[PDB]
Design a protein around this nucleic acid. Structure first.
Ligand SMILES: [K+]
Ligand SMILES: [K+]
Ligand SMILES: [K+]
Ligand SMILES: [K+]
Ligand SMILES: [K+]
Ligand SMILES: [K+]
Ligand SMILES: [K+]
Ligand SMILES: [K+]
Ligand SMILES: [K+]
Ligand SMILES: [K+]
Ligand SMILES: [K+]
Ligand SMILES: [K+]
Ligand SMILES: [K+]
Ligand SMILES: [K+]
Ligand SMILES: [K+]
Ligand SMILES: [K+]
Ligand SMILES: [K+]
Ligand SMILES: [K+]
Ligand SMILES: [K+]
Ligand SMILES: [K+]
Ligand SMILES: [K+]
Ligand SMILES: [K+]
Ligand SMILES: [K+]
Ligand SMILES: [K+]
Ligand SMILES: [K+]
Ligand SMILES: [K+]
Ligand SMILES: [K+]
Ligand SMILES: [K+]
Ligand SMILES: [K+]
Ligand SMILES: [Mg+2]
Ligand SMILES: [Mg+2]
Ligand SMILES: [Mg+2]
Ligand SMILES: [Mg+2]
Ligand SMILES: [Mg+2]
Ligand SMILES: [Mg+2]
Ligand SMILES: [Mg+2]
Ligand SMILES: [Mg+2]
Ligand SMILES: [Mg+2]
Ligand SMILES: [Mg+2]
Ligand SMILES: [Mg+2]
Ligand SMILES: [Mg+2]
Ligand SMILES: [Mg+2]
Ligand SMILES: [Mg+2]
Ligand SMILES: [Mg+2]
Ligand SMILES: [Mg+2]
Ligand SMILES: [Mg+2]
Ligand SMILES: [Mg+2]
Ligand SMILES: [Mg+2]
Ligand SMILES: [Mg+2]
Ligand SMILES: [Mg+2]
Ligand SMILES: [Mg+2]
Ligand SMILES: [Mg+2]
Ligand SMILES: [Mg+2]
Ligand SMILES: [Mg+2]
Ligand SMILES: [Mg+2]
Ligand SMILES: [Mg+2]
Ligand SMILES: [Mg+2]
Ligand SMILES: [Mg+2]
Ligand SMILES: [Mg+2]
Ligand SMILES: [Mg+2]
Ligand SMILES: [Mg+2]
Ligand SMILES: [Mg+2]
Ligand SMILES: [Mg+2]
Ligand SMILES: [Mg+2]
Ligand SMILES: [Mg+2]
Ligand SMILES: [Mg+2]
Ligand SMILES: [Mg+2]
Ligand SMILES: [Mg+2]
Ligand SMILES: [Mg+2]
Ligand SMILES: [Mg+2]
Ligand SMILES: [Mg+2]
Ligand SMILES: [Mg+2]
Lengths: 64, 50, 146
RNA sequence: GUAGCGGCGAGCGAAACGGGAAGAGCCCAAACCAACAAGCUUGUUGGGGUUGUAGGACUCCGAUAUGGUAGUCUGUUAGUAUAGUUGAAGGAUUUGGAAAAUUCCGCUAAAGAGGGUGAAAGCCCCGUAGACGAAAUGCUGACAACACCUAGGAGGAUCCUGAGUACGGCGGAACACGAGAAAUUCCGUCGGAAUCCGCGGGGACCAUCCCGCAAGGCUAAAUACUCCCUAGUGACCGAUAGUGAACCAGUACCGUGAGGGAAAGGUGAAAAGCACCCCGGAAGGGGAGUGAAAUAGAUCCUGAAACCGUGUGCCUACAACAAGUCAAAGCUCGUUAAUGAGUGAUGGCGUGCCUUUUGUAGAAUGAACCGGCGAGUUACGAUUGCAUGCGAGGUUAAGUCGAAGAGACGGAGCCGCAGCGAAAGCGAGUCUGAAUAGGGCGAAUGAGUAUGUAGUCGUAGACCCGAAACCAUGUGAUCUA
RNA sequence: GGUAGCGGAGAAAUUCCAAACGAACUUGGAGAUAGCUGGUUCUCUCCGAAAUAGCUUUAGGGCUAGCCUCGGAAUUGAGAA
RNA sequence: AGGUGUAGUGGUAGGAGAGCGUUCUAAGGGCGUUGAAGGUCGAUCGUGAGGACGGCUGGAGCGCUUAGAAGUGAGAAUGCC
RNA sequence: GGUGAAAUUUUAGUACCUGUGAAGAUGCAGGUUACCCGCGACAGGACGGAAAGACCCCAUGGAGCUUUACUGUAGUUUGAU
């Protein structure tokens, strides 16, 4: 059978032009009183999946 | 060439002969043979196939 | 070639490695699995992305966005690809399909100004980037939205 | 593995379009008409009628044609299945028990597939290619017969077009869709329409537009499967394999029963299976015979190892020895002739193998011994290396023809050639932002794709063996309560 | 002769229900699952660890990193003493 | 093709590389009643897996080369027979 | 005299002391004792045999049992229809 895409991951990451993965940021849902404006501003920005994590999840997104 | 029934019939029983028609010729057919004996019309048909 | 003298191209074919066939092969006994644990077991191992119970990376991250039902994606053609046609050519989605340049036009052909156009053409496409329109007409051609 | 579903977890997972295989369409209910029967309708029969660019009834005219069939033990005919017939061509020589082996010259081939025959046969046999054959019974196809269906056009005043139905509330279920914003389908329960100026759907809902016309039924082909039958095929097995079962196997045997379930093939070319004699009660031997061979004698081809024994070249009765190894006299032998072989007084050194462990000679584990069997595989996908073809391109899938082949056709589709953004969208840029700013991701700064092969992974039992248990049909109160 | 396993029967012991009954037997789901123990078969050559950190219903399991190996790219040579 | 020079060549888990042997397939080239495979013995060859050559046994089949495919290698599983 | 098993078993040419060692050795070290082979007896050792410890701990094992654990549910009951 075909390999299945991990649907939860596919809702959270995007394949970029270089083949990397763009991701959202944790700590961006609530309890914003617990975080400085600097933290909130810089968690507003997207990031990429780290090398160690990418090797762990890459097979789960082969045909995303 | 296609339709040459009697040439095919007379050739096939010889243990050293393999018979094909110009439109059914495979790589294994050719490589097996030491020699290829082709009629003129068979060669023309092959050149139309390829 | 000869059936008694076949030879593959170098490096085209390799010998399979068989584990558990003696110690001197280097994969005897434990067959490369090491000693005990879950990964030594037949069918052993955790599912992809499992971090042994640490909250997995994907659970840590938010879901984002939505997919537009009416989303339209256009087949991109750049000017350097239009240099392949002679001056005065009528470049059409049909012409591009026959040329094999665009096999799938998707929602339509869109022309983009990546390279430099050098031939005069009358280009027909679903959409034109503003720069592509200028380049085509600067070359003395003309564009038409279909 | 997209859209989606999902303690938005694990996982589950479409459909339409596009390309193919195969294709076929039809009958009712109602209006209305006629007949009959009954209590102006109210049933039976026959006619009539069948739908959405609305159809039909009805009223006008006009043709009784022309076409079709998923009808029948209706015959006739052909083919075909179920027995068969025919079917080419070799003799010597050497070896041997035997020739097909060998050598020598020949020959036949629409037959050099295969099997058998005293070893390995195109020409000895059965066959094979080819030609040919059916009293009888099926099966199939035609042809004929017969049966059954098949009317055009114009009119709308009126009538018909499936009700306890559609649909709704409530509770469940099915839809990839877990009640969700949940359309569509269905089941139970209750309520409950319209009807052509009508009704349903286009994923809550409304309007508009578009597409259809439910609550009646039938329908070949393309699809699934093979207990059996016929002819074959295999880089499938070759008796611990292959079916459990090559053999009198679902047998023997076990069990109250359901049920569980074996072992076990081979003399030889031919029995020519040892007349007769001798020892012995016989068994069994020894001769004599048979045979190419009987140390092929039926427990019969080959006949390994463990194990048991007989003979004896060397050693051994003051020695504490994982038992070998290195050094070594003496003795006995003579080879794949090698600075040889066997044995070995005596001397040095020396705590097995495996597993598992920080560490095992271990007083941890495992193996009585010998033999056989016994564990990373395959399919579909992902990905990387290597390889080949082509290259800003690469490539077909199903399918059709074809040897269960290659190949040809097939461009639907898939990957790549453009990215950025949640998205509208813009595009070598784009997003963020008021920003010509900065920054993110991209381009600049190009290589891909098909296939093979190997490494690894994923879904599958997924390297092999092992639970206690769980669930669902059955069988048991001949023991025992 | 009757009662049968989600059960029966029990002067009650978790007692009996065909020589092991806290839940019979048989067949099937079924190759249940087993982060556990055991086993995993030819050879030589090159190189060669770890027994650590972080997180973990985690502690004899796992994951990323560290340490090994193979291949590759490239620089004002970035390593070691 | 080889030669010289320097250096290097313990190893569990494990990575890489290169080979030995088994059965089958294809092609080629061969061996077999003047004795195939198998068995057994020997003082034989190669760096290893392993390979020959003789005698005896045996009585029909089987090597070799190149390539292909594998139910391809056992001493341990309180393994099964 | 006849008949004739079994558990066990890595191979065994199977001493003692003190020591050593995975910390309790017939087998290692040092020393001591001991001619070769049995028979009848005894059990101190072979951490002797038998049973993959039952105690103990562990496994995000199992089963039976309990309840004001959680979530359900047969039954019972109340209303609407
Ligand atoms: K995210
Ligand atoms: K938060
Ligand atoms: K490994
Ligand atoms: K898919
Ligand atoms: K979960
Ligand atoms: K009609
Ligand atoms: K023959
Ligand atoms: K007939
Ligand atoms: K619904
Ligand atoms: K619709
Ligand atoms: K419609
Ligand atoms: K014999
Ligand atoms: K002896
Ligand atoms: K010695
Ligand atoms: K023990
Ligand atoms: K930018
Ligand atoms: K900007
Ligand atoms: K390539
Ligand atoms: K590949
Ligand atoms: K498996
Ligand atoms: K696997
Ligand atoms: K009774
Ligand atoms: K009792
Ligand atoms: K690495
Ligand atoms: K021999
Ligand atoms: K064993
Ligand atoms: K020990
Ligand atoms: K004792
Ligand atoms: K129990
Ligand atoms: Mg928010
Ligand atoms: Mg803070
Ligand atoms: Mg292979
Ligand atoms: Mg190793
Ligand atoms: Mg081993
Ligand atoms: Mg192990
Ligand atoms: Mg461990
Ligand atoms: Mg491990
Ligand atoms: Mg004849
Ligand atoms: Mg002859
Ligand atoms: Mg559902
Ligand atoms: Mg509806
Ligand atoms: Mg309802
Ligand atoms: Mg319409
Ligand atoms: Mg059908
Ligand atoms: Mg059998
Ligand atoms: Mg045998
Ligand atoms: Mg059997
Ligand atoms: Mg003999
Ligand atoms: Mg015999
Ligand atoms: Mg003395
Ligand atoms: Mg002496
Ligand atoms: Mg310990
Ligand atoms: Mg031991
Ligand atoms: Mg001991
Ligand atoms: Mg033991
Ligand atoms: Mg009963
Ligand atoms: Mg009874
Ligand atoms: Mg009690
Ligand atoms: Mg009992
Ligand atoms: Mg199952
Ligand atoms: Mg080293
Ligand atoms: Mg937790
Ligand atoms: Mg060294
Ligand atoms: Mg053989
Ligand atoms: Mg095997
Ligand atoms: Mg054994
Ligand atoms: Mg000590
Ligand atoms: Mg001691
Ligand atoms: Mg010793
Ligand atoms: Mg010592
Ligand atoms: Mg004991
Ligand atoms: Mg235990």
């Amino acid at each position: 059978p075909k390999q299945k895409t991990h649907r939860g991951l596919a809702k959270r990451v995007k394949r970029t032009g270089g083949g990397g993965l763009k991701r959202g940021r944790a700590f961006t849902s609530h309890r914003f009183h617990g975080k400085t404006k600097k933290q909130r501003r810089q968690l507003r920005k997207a990031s990429m999946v780290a090398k160690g994590d990418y090797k762990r999840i890459r097979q789960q997104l082969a045909r995303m | 060439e296609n339709g040459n029934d009697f040439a095919a019939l007379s050739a096939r029983n010889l243990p050293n002969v393999s018979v094909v028609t110009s439109d059914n010729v495979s790589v294994l057919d050719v490589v097996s043979a030491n020699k290829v004996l082709a009629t003129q019309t068979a060669l023309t048909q092959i050149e139309e196939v390829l | 070639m000869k059936l008694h003298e076949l030879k593959p191209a170098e490096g085209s074919r390799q010998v399979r490695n068989r584990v558990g066939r003696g110690t001197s092969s280097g994969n005897g006994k434990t067959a490369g699995r090491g000693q005990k644990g879950q990964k030594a077991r037949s069918g052993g191992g955790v599912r992809l992305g499992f971090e042994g119970g640490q909250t997995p990376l994907f659970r840590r991250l938010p879901k984002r966005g939505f997919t537009n039902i009416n989303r339209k994606d256009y087949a991109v053609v750049n000017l350097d690809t239009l240099n392949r046609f002679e001056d005065g050519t009528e470049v059409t989605p049909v012409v591009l399909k026959e040329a094999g340049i665009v096999k799938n036009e998707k929602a339509g052909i869109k022309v983009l100004a990546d390279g430099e156009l050098t031939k005069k053409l009358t280009v027909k496409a679903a959409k034109f980037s503003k720069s592509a329109q200028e380049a085509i007409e600067a070359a003395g051609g003309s564009i038409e939205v279909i």
